[PDB]
Design an enzyme around this catalytic site. Sequence first.
Site, short mmCIF file in Angstrom:
data_model
loop_
_atom_site.label_atom_id
_atom_site.label_comp_id
_atom_site.label_asym_id
_atom_site.label_seq_id
_atom_site.Cartn_x
_atom_site.Cartn_y
_atom_site.Cartn_z
N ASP A 1 -42.33 -33.20 -41.72
CA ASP A 1 -41.67 -34.39 -42.23
C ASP A 1 -41.80 -35.54 -41.23
N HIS B 1 -34.92 -34.35 -48.72
CA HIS B 1 -36.19 -33.99 -48.11
C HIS B 1 -36.52 -32.52 -48.37
N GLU C 1 -36.19 -39.04 -60.30
CA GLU C 1 -35.55 -38.31 -61.39
C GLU C 1 -35.22 -39.24 -62.55
N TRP D 1 -34.67 -41.80 -52.90
CA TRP D 1 -35.98 -41.71 -53.53
C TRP D 1 -36.03 -40.63 -54.60
N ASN D 2 -35.43 -39.47 -54.35
CA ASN D 2 -35.43 -38.42 -55.36
C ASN D 2 -34.65 -38.84 -56.60
N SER D 3 -33.55 -39.57 -56.42
CA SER D 3 -32.75 -40.08 -57.53
C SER D 3 -33.55 -41.06 -58.38
N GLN E 1 -26.89 -33.37 -61.42
CA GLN E 1 -27.41 -34.72 -61.63
C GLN E 1 -28.51 -34.74 -62.68
N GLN F 1 -33.20 -47.35 -49.02
CA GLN F 1 -32.67 -47.67 -50.34
C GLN F 1 -32.82 -49.13 -50.74
C1 LIG Z 1 -41.72 -50.22 -40.46
C2 LIG Z 1 -40.36 -50.25 -39.72
C3 LIG Z 1 -40.39 -51.42 -38.65
C4 LIG Z 1 -41.46 -51.09 -37.56
C5 LIG Z 1 -41.12 -51.81 -36.24
O1 LIG Z 1 -39.73 -51.63 -35.94
C6 LIG Z 1 -39.05 -52.82 -35.63
O2 LIG Z 1 -39.82 -53.58 -34.61
C7 LIG Z 1 -39.08 -54.76 -34.12
C8 LIG Z 1 -39.87 -55.41 -33.00
O3 LIG Z 1 -40.76 -54.41 -32.39
C9 LIG Z 1 -41.29 -54.80 -31.12
O4 LIG Z 1 -42.13 -55.98 -31.30
C10 LIG Z 1 -43.36 -55.70 -32.06
C11 LIG Z 1 -44.24 -56.93 -32.03
O5 LIG Z 1 -43.57 -57.98 -31.32
C12 LIG Z 1 -44.12 -54.51 -31.49
O6 LIG Z 1 -45.46 -54.92 -31.15
C13 LIG Z 1 -43.47 -53.96 -30.29
O7 LIG Z 1 -44.18 -52.74 -29.89
C14 LIG Z 1 -42.05 -53.63 -30.54
O8 LIG Z 1 -41.44 -53.25 -29.27
C15 LIG Z 1 -37.71 -54.39 -33.60
O9 LIG Z 1 -36.99 -55.60 -33.25
C16 LIG Z 1 -36.93 -53.63 -34.62
O10 LIG Z 1 -35.70 -53.16 -34.00
C17 LIG Z 1 -37.67 -52.47 -35.16
O11 LIG Z 1 -36.92 -51.92 -36.31
C18 LIG Z 1 -41.96 -51.23 -35.11
C19 LIG Z 1 -41.62 -49.68 -34.94
C20 LIG Z 1 -43.42 -51.38 -35.43
O12 LIG Z 1 -41.68 -51.87 -33.96
C21 LIG Z 1 -39.27 -50.44 -40.69
C22 LIG Z 1 -37.97 -51.02 -40.04
C23 LIG Z 1 -36.78 -50.18 -40.67
C24 LIG Z 1 -37.32 -48.83 -40.78
C25 LIG Z 1 -37.35 -48.33 -39.33
C26 LIG Z 1 -36.69 -48.23 -41.51
C27 LIG Z 1 -35.18 -48.24 -41.19
C28 LIG Z 1 -34.58 -46.94 -40.55
C29 LIG Z 1 -35.06 -45.90 -40.81
C30 LIG Z 1 -36.55 -45.86 -41.36
C31 LIG Z 1 -36.74 -44.61 -42.29
C32 LIG Z 1 -36.48 -43.23 -41.36
C33 LIG Z 1 -35.10 -43.36 -40.48
O13 LIG Z 1 -33.93 -43.10 -41.41
C34 LIG Z 1 -33.73 -41.73 -41.44
O14 LIG Z 1 -33.98 -41.21 -42.81
C35 LIG Z 1 -32.77 -40.87 -43.62
C36 LIG Z 1 -33.20 -40.04 -44.76
O15 LIG Z 1 -33.85 -40.84 -45.74
C37 LIG Z 1 -31.67 -40.11 -42.86
O16 LIG Z 1 -31.60 -38.78 -43.33
C38 LIG Z 1 -31.87 -40.09 -41.39
O17 LIG Z 1 -30.60 -39.74 -40.73
C39 LIG Z 1 -32.31 -41.42 -40.91
O18 LIG Z 1 -32.33 -41.42 -39.49
C40 LIG Z 1 -34.93 -44.68 -39.84
C41 LIG Z 1 -33.51 -44.72 -39.17
C42 LIG Z 1 -35.99 -44.83 -38.72
C43 LIG Z 1 -37.06 -47.19 -42.04
C44 LIG Z 1 -36.39 -47.20 -43.49
C45 LIG Z 1 -38.56 -46.99 -42.31
O19 LIG Z 1 -38.77 -46.35 -43.70
C46 LIG Z 1 -39.38 -48.24 -42.29
C47 LIG Z 1 -38.81 -49.12 -41.23
C48 LIG Z 1 -38.58 -49.99 -42.45
O1 LIG Z 2 -23.89 -34.91 -56.97
C1 LIG Z 2 -25.09 -34.83 -56.67
C2 LIG Z 2 -25.75 -35.65 -55.69
C3 LIG Z 2 -27.06 -35.48 -55.43
N1 LIG Z 2 -27.81 -34.52 -56.09
C4 LIG Z 2 -29.24 -34.36 -55.79
O2 LIG Z 2 -29.46 -34.60 -54.40
C5 LIG Z 2 -30.72 -35.34 -54.26
C6 LIG Z 2 -30.46 -36.62 -53.55
O3 LIG Z 2 -31.68 -37.05 -53.02
P1 LIG Z 2 -31.94 -38.66 -52.82
O4 LIG Z 2 -33.30 -38.86 -52.21
O5 LIG Z 2 -31.86 -39.37 -54.15
O6 LIG Z 2 -30.78 -39.24 -51.80
P2 LIG Z 2 -30.21 -38.64 -50.39
O7 LIG Z 2 -29.05 -37.71 -50.66
O8 LIG Z 2 -31.31 -37.86 -49.71
O9 LIG Z 2 -29.78 -39.77 -49.49
C7 LIG Z 2 -31.26 -35.64 -55.66
O10 LIG Z 2 -32.30 -34.71 -55.98
C8 LIG Z 2 -30.08 -35.43 -56.57
O11 LIG Z 2 -30.51 -34.90 -57.83
C9 LIG Z 2 -27.24 -33.70 -57.04
O12 LIG Z 2 -27.88 -32.84 -57.64
N2 LIG Z 2 -25.90 -33.90 -57.28
#
Ligand SMILES: C[C@@H](CC[C@@H](O[C@@H]1O[C@H](CO[C@@H]2O[C@@H](CO)[C@@H](O)[C@H](O)[C@H]2O)[C@@H](O)[C@H](O)[C@H]1O)C(C)(C)O)[C@@H]1CC[C@@]2(C)[C@@H]3CC=C4[C@@H](CC[C@H](O[C@@H]5O[C@@H](CO)[C@@H](O)[C@H](O)[C@H]5O)C4(C)C)[C@]3(C)[C@@H](O)C[C@]12C
Ligand SMILES: O=c1ccn([C@@H]2O[C@H](COP(=O)(O)OP(=O)(O)O)[C@@H](O)[C@H]2O)c(=O)[nH]1
Length: 436
Positions: free
Chosen positions: A113, A14, A337, A332-334, A314, A354
Amino acid sequence: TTTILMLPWLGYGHLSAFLELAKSLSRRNFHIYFCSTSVNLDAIKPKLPSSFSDSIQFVELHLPSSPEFPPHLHTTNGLPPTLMPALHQAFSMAAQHFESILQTLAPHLLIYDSLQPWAPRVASSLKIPAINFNTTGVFVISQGLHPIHYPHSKFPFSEFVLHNHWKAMYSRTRKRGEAFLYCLHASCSVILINSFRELEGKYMDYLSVLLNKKVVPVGPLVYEPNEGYSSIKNWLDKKEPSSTVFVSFGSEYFPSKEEMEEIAHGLEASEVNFIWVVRFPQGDNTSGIEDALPKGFLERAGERGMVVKGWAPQAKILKHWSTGGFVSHCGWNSVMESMMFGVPIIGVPMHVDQPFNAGLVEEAGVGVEAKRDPDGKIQRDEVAKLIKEVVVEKTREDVRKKAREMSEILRSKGEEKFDEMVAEISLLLKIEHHHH
Ligand SMILES: C[C@@H](CC[C@@H](O[C@@H]1O[C@H](CO[C@@H]2O[C@@H](CO)[C@@H](O)[C@H](O)[C@H]2O)[C@@H](O)[C@H](O)[C@H]1O)C(C)(C)O)[C@@H]1CC[C@@]2(C)[C@@H]3CC=C4[C@@H](CC[C@H](O[C@@H]5O[C@@H](CO)[C@@H](O)[C@H](O)[C@H]5O)C4(C)C)[C@]3(C)[C@@H](O)C[C@]12C
Ligand SMILES: O=c1ccn([C@@H]2O[C@H](COP(=O)(O)OP(=O)(O)O)[C@@H](O)[C@H]2O)c(=O)[nH]1
Ligand SMILES: C[C@@H](CC[C@@H](O[C@@H]1O[C@H](CO[C@@H]2O[C@@H](CO)[C@@H](O)[C@H](O)[C@H]2O)[C@@H](O)[C@H](O)[C@H]1O)C(C)(C)O)[C@@H]1CC[C@@]2(C)[C@@H]3CC=C4[C@@H](CC[C@H](O[C@@H]5O[C@@H](CO)[C@@H](O)[C@H](O)[C@H]5O)C4(C)C)[C@]3(C)[C@@H](O)C[C@]12C
C-alpha cells in the site's frame, strides 16, 4: 505457482480493496499471502468465501504493543483520532517482523500500500520485486502534485478548486506527502490503482507523466455481499422508491458535535427519509446517540429517520430501491460503491483525499458537493438544499441519470478488468528472473 504477498494499510477501506484484488489474482492462478494485524484479519475474513481458502492465506503482522496501545487498537477502524500518529509509528516499527515474514514465505512478488515506504525497501534488500497498489483515486494525487511543479499553470481538464479549509490543512505534512509519493515512485515498473478510465482516464495519463511511472487501473473494486439488514429492510420496504438517503462517514472519521448538528438539521429541514450511521471511537464511554444529536431530533423526524449505531450494511442499503441518495464523506470505496449501485452522491467530504473525491464526483456529474462556508464549516442549509434537489423534489435528475449510466458501465465489466495487471506482473517477474 506464482506467490504474492499483499501488505495493505491498516484501514478497513484499504483492506477491503486489497482483498477484492486478492480474489481476482486468486482466480488467475496466483497464491496470495494476505498480511495484516490480527484485529484487521478478524474484521476481513468474514468477507472471504471458503472457495479461496487454498488460494488466499492470512498472515499475521505484529506491531509493538502496550497496555495503552493494545493489539485490538492496531487498526484505523474506530480508532480515536488522537491515536492515529501512534498507529503510523507502530506500523513502521513492524518492518523487522515484516522482513522475517518475507524470508520465511519467500514470495515472488510484494504488493504494498501507499503508506509504508519501509515495505519496498525491505523487499528490495531481499531481491523481491514490489509493486504499489494504491487503493484510492488518481484525481487527488495529480491535483496535489501539479501545483508543486507548475504553480502558475491551471490544472488541465478540470474546473475543480480546493476550498481554502483543505489548502490550509495540507500546508510533518511534507513528510507524510513525501512518504506517500515515495511508495508510488519506488514501485517496480507499474503502479496499480483502484480506478477506471471512464472516470479518471485523462488524470491517469497525466499522473503517469507527472510521476514518470506507468499507471495500471485495476478497476472499481467493489465488495458485494450475498441481523442488522432484516430490521433495516422492513423499515425501507415501507418507504417510497428513491426517497431515502443513507448517511455515513466511513470507518475512520467521527464528526464533531457541531458537524453532527449541521448534518442533523440539514436532514430535518430536507424532510427526507434517512438512515444515519453514528459511530463512537473505541474508547469513548461518555458519548451516546441521544447526546450526540440535537435534542429531540429523532422524535421530530419520527418515521422518516433511523439511526444505526456502530456499523450498517452499507452495500445492501445502497442497493435497496428506496435509496435515492448517499450523504457520504466521499471515501473512495463509498464513492465506487455508490456509482456501482447507481446512487447519487451528496458529498460532505471531511479530510485527506475526500475533498478531491467530492470534486471528481461533481465533475463526473454522478453527485453534488455540499460546500463549506468560508471558515470551513459544514452548512445545514447547503445539505438541506442538495437533498431537496436530488432526492425529495428531484429537480436534479441529471445526477441520477448519470449515476445510473455509470452503474451500467461498471456492471458491464468483467475479469478483463485484470488482464493488464496480470500481464505486467508476468513481464516483471520474467525480467527480474534474468537479472537474478
Ligand atoms: C501530492 C501531495 C503534495 C505533495 C507535496 O507536499 C506538499 O509540498 C509543500 C511544499 O513542498 C516543498 O517545496 C516543493 C517545491 O518548493 C518541493 O520541491 C520541496 O521538496 C518541498 O520541501 C508543503 O508546503 C506541503 O506541506 C506539502 O503537503 C510534496 C510532497 C511534493 O512536497 C498532496 C498534498 C496532500 C496530500 C499529502 C494528501 C493529504 C494527506 C494525505 C495524502 C493521502 C495519504 C495520507 O493520508 C492517510 O490516508 C488515510 C486513509 O485514506 C488515513 O487512513 C491515514 O491515517 C492518513 O495518514 C496523507 C496524510 C499523506 C494526500 C491526500 C495525498 O493523496 C496527496 C497529497 C494531496
Ligand atoms: O457503517 C458502515 C461504514 C462503512 N462501511 C464500509 O467501509 C468502507 C469505507 O471505506 P471508504 O473508502 O469509503 O472510507 P474510509 O472508512 O476508509 O475512510 C466502505 O466499503 C463501506 O461500505 C460499511 O460497510 N458500513
Ligand atoms: C523525497 C522523495 C522520496 C522520499 C523518501 O526518501 C528516499 O528514502 C530511501 C530510504 O528509505 C528509507 O529507509 C528504509 C530502510 O532503509 C526505511 O527505514 C524507511 O522507512 C525509508 O523511509 C532512500 O534510499 C532514497 O534515496 C530516498 O530518496 C523517503 C524519506 C519518504 O523514504 C519523494 C518521492 C516522490 C518524489 C520522488 C517525488 C515524485 C516524482 C518526482 C519528484 C519531483 C521531480 C520528478 O518530477 C518531474 O520533474 C518536475 C520538475 O522537476 C516536473 O517538471 C515533471 O513533470 C515531473 O515529472 C520526479 C518524477 C522524480 C518528487 C515530487 C520529489 O519532489 C521528491 C519525492 C516527493
